Structures are given as structure tokens and as C-alpha cells.
Design a protein around this ligand. Structure first.
Ligand SMILES: [Cu+]
Length: 128
């Protein structure tokens, strides 16, 4: 592939990767998220959520208060660069966003906002 990445989150509360790079040549970048586990999304749900390193704690916290039916995401949360839905076993979702949204010199994290998962399910995205 190119200007896309495949990410898996499993039954062990892990992303398969902790670091993503995006080609500064890309206008747009795609994240394809899957869940190769057997647990359902209300006990081991995963989403792919991207923000700067410094907004990460805020988005996680309010994502928790927004609740399962809202994908553990605050609706139209302005800190969120890109988000998928919350998925569980056997499910998938992709998200495409404008690379232009990565300003140069910022630092970005991706993570799951299912309560508790970010302690393990987090990783770095960087502009390549
Ligand atoms: Cu998760």
C-alpha cells in the first residue's frame, strides 16, 4: 500500500503497531482498522482515534463520559483529527483524513478511547 495503513486491535487490548508514519507527499491518509479477536465491542471494543500528544488525555477522558453508544467519543470533539467507530470481534472501519491536518512540528498520538485501553492501546503517528 501507500497513503494508507492497516491496524488491528485484539482480544489482548493491543494495537498491532505502536508507530505510524505518513508520507508528507500524501494529500490524504487512510487508516483501515480491524478486530481479529472474538470478544464483542462492549467488553473489548476498539476505535482508532488521532489527536496531538497534548490533547490525548482530554479526548480519552471525555470519550469515556460520552459512553458506549457514542463510540466512547465526545460528538464533534474539535481535538480529534481522525476517528473510526468503535468495533468489536470480526468488524472493521476505515477513516480517511487530510494530511494537511498534521501541522509540521506538532506531535501526534493514536489510541483507543474504550475506557482503560489507552494505557496499552496508543502509539505515535509521525509525518514522514
Ligand atoms: Cu480498545
Amino acid at each position: 500500500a501507500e497513503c494508507s495503513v492497516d491496524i488491528q486491535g485484539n482480544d489482548q487490548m493491543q494495537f498491532n503497531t505502536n508507530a505510524i508514519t505518513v508520507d508528507k507527499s500524501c494529500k490524504q491518509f487512510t487508516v483501515n482498522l480491524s478486530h481479529p479477536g472474538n470478544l464483542p465491542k462492549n467488553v473489548m471494543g476498539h476505535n482508532f482515534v488521532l489527536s496531538t500528544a497534548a490533547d490525548m488525555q482530554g479526548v480519552v477522558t471525555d470519550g469515556m463520559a460520552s459512553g458506549l453508544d457514542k463510540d466512547f467519543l465526545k460528538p464533534d470533539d474539535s481535538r480529534v483529527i481522525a476517528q473510526t467507530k468503535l468495533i468489536g470481534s470480526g468488524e472493521k472501519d476505515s477513516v480517511t483524513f487530510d494530511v494537511s491536518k498534521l501541522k509540521e512540528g506538532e506531535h501526534w498520538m493514536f489510541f483507543c478511547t474504550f475506557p482503560g485501553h489507552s494505557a496499552l492501546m496508543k502509539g505515535t503517528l509521525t509525518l514522514k
